[PDB]
From a paper:
pmcMechanistic target of rapamycin (mTOR, also known as mammalian TOR) is an essential serine/threonine protein kinase that responds to nutrients, growth factors, and cellular energy to promote cell growth. mTOR nucleates two distinct complexes, mTORC1 and mTORC2, each characterized by specific subunits, targets, downstream signaling pathways, and functions. mTORC1 contains mTOR, regulatory-associated protein of mTOR (RAPTOR), and mammalian lethal with SEC13 protein 8 (mLST8). RAPTOR binds the LST2 TOS sequence to present LST2 to the kinase catalytic site in mTOR for phosphorylation of LST2 S670. mTORC1-dependent phosphorylation at S670 leads to monoubiquitination and stabilization of LST2.
To assess whether the LST2 TOS motif is functional, we examined whether a synthetic peptide corresponding to the LST2 TOS sequence binds RAPTOR. To further improve the resolution of the visualization of TOS motif interactions, we analyzed mTORC1 in complex with the synthetic LST2 TOS peptide, for which higher concentrations could be reached compared to full-length LST2. F401 and M403 anchor the TOS peptide by binding in particularly deep cavities in the TOS-binding site, via hydrophobic interactions with surrounding residues. We performed fluorescence anisotropy with purified RAPTOR protein and a FITC-labeled LST2 TOS peptide including flanking residues (amino acids 395 to 407).
Residue numbers in the entry:
A (entry chain B): 1144 to 1222
B (entry chain H): 399 to 407
C (entry chain A): 529 to 549, 578 to 595, 599 to 633, 644 to 786, 791 to 879
D (entry chain F): 18 to 219, 236 to 686, 806 to 840, 950 to 1116, 1125 to 1292, 1303 to 1331
Write the structure that this text describes.
Amino acid sequence: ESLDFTDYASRIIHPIVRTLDQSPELRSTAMDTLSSLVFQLGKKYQIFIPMVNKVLVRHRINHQRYDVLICRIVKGYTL
Amino acid sequence: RVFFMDDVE
Amino acid sequence: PQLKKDIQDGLLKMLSLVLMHDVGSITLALRTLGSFEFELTQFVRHCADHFLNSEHKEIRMEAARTCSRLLTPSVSQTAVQVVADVLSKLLVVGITDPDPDIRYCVLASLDERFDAHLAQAENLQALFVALNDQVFEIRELAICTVGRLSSMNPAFVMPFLRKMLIQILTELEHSGIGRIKEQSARMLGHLVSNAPRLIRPYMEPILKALILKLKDPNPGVINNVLATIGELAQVSGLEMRKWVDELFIIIMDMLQDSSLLAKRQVALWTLGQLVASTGYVVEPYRKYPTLLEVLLNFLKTEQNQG
Amino acid sequence: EADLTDWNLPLAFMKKRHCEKIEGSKSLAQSWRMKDRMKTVSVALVLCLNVGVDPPDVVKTTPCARLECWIDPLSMGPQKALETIGANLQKQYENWQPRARYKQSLDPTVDEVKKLCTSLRRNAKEERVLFHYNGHGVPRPTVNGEVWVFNKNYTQYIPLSIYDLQTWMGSPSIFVYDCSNAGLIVKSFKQFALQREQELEVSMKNCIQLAACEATELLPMIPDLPADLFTSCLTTPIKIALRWFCMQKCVSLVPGVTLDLIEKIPGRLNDRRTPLGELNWIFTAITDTIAWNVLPRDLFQKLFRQDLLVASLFRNFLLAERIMRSYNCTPVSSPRLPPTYMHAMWQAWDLAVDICLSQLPTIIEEGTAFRHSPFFAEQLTAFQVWLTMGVENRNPPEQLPIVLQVLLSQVHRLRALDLLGRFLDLGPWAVSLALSVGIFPYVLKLLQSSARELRPLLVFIWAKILAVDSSCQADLVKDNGHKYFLSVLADPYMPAEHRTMTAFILAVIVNSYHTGQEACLQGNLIAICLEQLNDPHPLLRQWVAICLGRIWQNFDSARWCGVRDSAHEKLYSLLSDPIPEVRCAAVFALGTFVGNSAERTDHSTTIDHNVAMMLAQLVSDGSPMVRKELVVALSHLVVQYESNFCTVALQFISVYTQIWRVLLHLAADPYPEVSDVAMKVLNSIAYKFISATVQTGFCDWSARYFAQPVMKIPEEHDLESQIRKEREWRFLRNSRVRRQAQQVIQKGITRLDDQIFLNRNPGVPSVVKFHPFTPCIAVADKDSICFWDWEKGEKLDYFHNGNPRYTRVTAMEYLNGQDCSLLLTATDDGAIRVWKNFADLEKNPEMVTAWQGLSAGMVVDWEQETGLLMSSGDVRIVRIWDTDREMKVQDIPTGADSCVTSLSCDSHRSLIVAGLGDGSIRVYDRRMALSECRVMTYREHTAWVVKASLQKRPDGHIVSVSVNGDVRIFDPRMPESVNVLQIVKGLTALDIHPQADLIACGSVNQFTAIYNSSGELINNIKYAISCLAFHPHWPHLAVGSNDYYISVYSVE
């Protein structure tokens, strides 16, 4: 919320997907943190959308805020 | 204007 | 080469027949397609879908190698756009694919041949994201490529390289962890080698920080810092004549006796690069009378040819 | 090989006018225009500093913060400090907005503030007013929404409700707050505005607010920084940024830099060549860049472009946000700006500052020469790199405001103009972005500069601007830059391309805009264009003619000037110009000149008649678009003389009679669009309103050329393109077909009796032609044109020629047979038309061009290499239409009473052979003069010549066969026949093959005799066989009897 993470996008994203794959217990918390990181990054997150969507489909991950954020990003509409 | 433009003759 | 055209026509016909339509056969086909030269657009666009929709790690790796080798012929606006989107897919693969081996391999495959298209803003942003990768080797390669691109797009590279220099210097100065300082010093050496124009104004602070680290009470960190000062000696170009005396004192202090963890090979190399860069000759002999004795003793003691 | 022959073949009727439909490109909604320009007439500076007294709410530390507006209050006494700080703040604000009424309130009362706000509002009721508040010396604002001020004796802090404050103020105003809890002030202001909106049922967006900190946050108390931190950021961004830089750990990267050195920095904020000016310019460019990149376009235009003071305040507010973030303080603005502390451009700002100030020790002590920072050069280099491969509509480059900022100076102005023009060449979207970013006023100001090197870049940029947006003509006329463009056009040394672009700029300036029309009439434009009318450049001539026509569009003054300059007479030459585009431009000019007579003297009547007579001889024009412009010009003539034309029309139920006959010719035009327009124009005459006037889209279609990119390499040159690869593949197939046919011919000719297929057509097959390479055979019926296949055996398409019942399709041809082929359909009356997309799955019949010819049936003999087209028939003349120029080049007299039944020509030579109904077969050479064109005239037949074909070999043999069915083989170098044969007493049709000497003859008794030139018997196939054709390469023969049956034969 308060810092800039445009630099460490991979440094945080890759552990997140690995944690999602390796532990169903932390799926909710990891998805919330990832959604916050997406909201902070904005358009810079378009790189990781394919891989992350693949993981979500692989694990049926349906998060409302993450889904709406990705939809807004792909639409290009900003809020 | 909004910006000062110099050296225009 | 009686009929090389006929030979290549027959081979291309057979390759098209094979690729129009198990796992090991596809691996062999990809290796063959990437091995030697050929005469390839629809295949590239189709394999672009192929390595996306292939869960096999070996298949993805072979496809990545094949794409990189086949992209050697790199004016058509349509073809430039095709190569641009192919490169974009290649970069998103090299940033997002979990497999560190495949990420490093594709990033390495991004050679000097792709520099023109790599200098673009989006590709530079992807490289900026990639520079903060888990794999330290991938990090080093990313910083090397970015430093090499400091001349093509200075406006977008120089500020980011300055910020990464800031982070590397503070990491080296503050982090009291051997591995972290090893990676920081190695990063500094790569930045020196690849961005001399960026680091040249900051020669005084970088050298001062390296000196302060060198005076502190792990062999990887000390070897890396010695390599870094050697490269900085080349980069500065007579701009570090003030600090030659202290550099000589510390390098000879660690040069004498083998108890030091730092390697005499890198120590002698950086001493030679320092001498060549700053033109310090004869005067070191007069100031330090044991220098000749030490250097001649090394010929009787050391066994490594290097 | 045979590839070079295919490569060096002109593609007739394959150009922009033919492929692209003629019409104007629709103008997009240009919202770049500024809706309104507001001005900060007055500024109010309320300074509740309370010097010498600390507010009870905060217990400041012993050092605390003592710098307020860079003045230490305790040094010069309380009241003197208060007045001095007020004056200094007024000066700081005057640095950005000098022209404003500044009134300072120093520890004021409620009544004093009320009187000031009322007075300022009365002074500026409908304009923005700045209200600055500095509550450092008063307690923090209450949650109720009150601001503390002083009473008369300065013993108690009397609150002031924000509702009352905004009540005193109007709707248009901006407020700046510098206090610990300005967030509370902002929240209360918004809540009270919502309360006002609720009350209004039974001033939110207009008001602008800037705040120092969030409600919970407190102002920093670090001794190093000034207490008046937010105001210092908003007023002295460079000073505060340099000081903030000199405190960060980044200073360790440049030793020997200290606040004292920062204080003794040289240069002013105005002289950009100085260090301080350079830093200010870089800072402005970087903050503008961040604003444009982050904020949306609408908010960016509303904030950073509306007025100078608001734009500067927000540009400094971005720096305020970045600086205050490091001290746990979040500045607040009424329009919530997305955070900009993390934007990458701030790293460039730090790098530029570090580079610029690193020379300060030598500047101050040693006194070196200030070397200019490479920031702008590097950014322009990045913009160039983006342009190198930015063809796609990807993310816009981040350096557009940087280009705008560098345009102001002169050091990099030329390069900036070059790159900006290159960017505009990308397309209308790029030009729209350049307009939205705010380049229009500056590119307009560039016209005042007299530097001659700027002229080409300026005209290129402005041409793109006008091509996208045509409303710029008003601003161009107001700025009087049309004199700049006139001087550009009046320079012979200037390249023709830039002169053409200047002519286009003037044309769009004078497009249906009276003020520009009379301005250019005053501007000697008519004489200038006439001087630059005969330039060896088709594009220049076309646009000059278009501009000349547009100038006298409903302008009698321009018409009189053209009359004095004999502009009509000088433009008479362009009607014979080879280029149809230039001809169309000339016709448009003549028509517009005619259209605005406005009942002048008998001289005007005579000159109008002269122009009408000159335009009357362009009826026999190949280009239907030119003929459409002819219709438009004659419509101008009609509207000028409606009564006379009505009288002429009523006479039939000598000038207008000839014009009406011309209009009848245009009405009976093969082109459907031209015929429809002409018929509507003529129908308007009979029922005699203004709605009948129709304007063609030719002018806007030509204008679209500058909208399209020009600098980039054309697609055809591209070596790796799909289109080029497709053409190469077709050429490869053509070469293979030619080689295989050559092999078959060398192997000899065997008896041909195989029947590939037998189908029935709705109509009698009149004439059959085979496509040279693709397996498509064109069979023309009385009212339809069938396109069959001899491989798949299916019906592909069914066309309708559209010719009347009496007429008939006599001959056909396949233009550009090598690739991208067309179909030529020449009716017996004279109507010649071209068909495209005749045998394609995803495309329908398309008519490329059509034009009435001349005026047995009609005989055609296409010559692909030279591109010439000749039509012959009942007329005693053989015309030679040139497809490249669309004009008739030569009209050789036949010198025979009988109709020309057949015609043929030899490639690489002029050996036009024309059979005749009487029996004689004449030969004409066009190389010599017309009266000497006829070379030989031998007569050995008395019957209609069925087919006087000629062999493509150098030893051309004229195998002439008449209705008598007797074969005579003449030669172009001999006066007598070489071989004589008699085959069939009554012959109906015949066909020959150049490659294989097979003379295919018909018979009334269903016999199909296929003999040789020497007359040896080969085949007599047993079934009015009026159609036989041979494949140009394969030994294939198609035979069509009186019955509507079609067959294709092959030699095994």
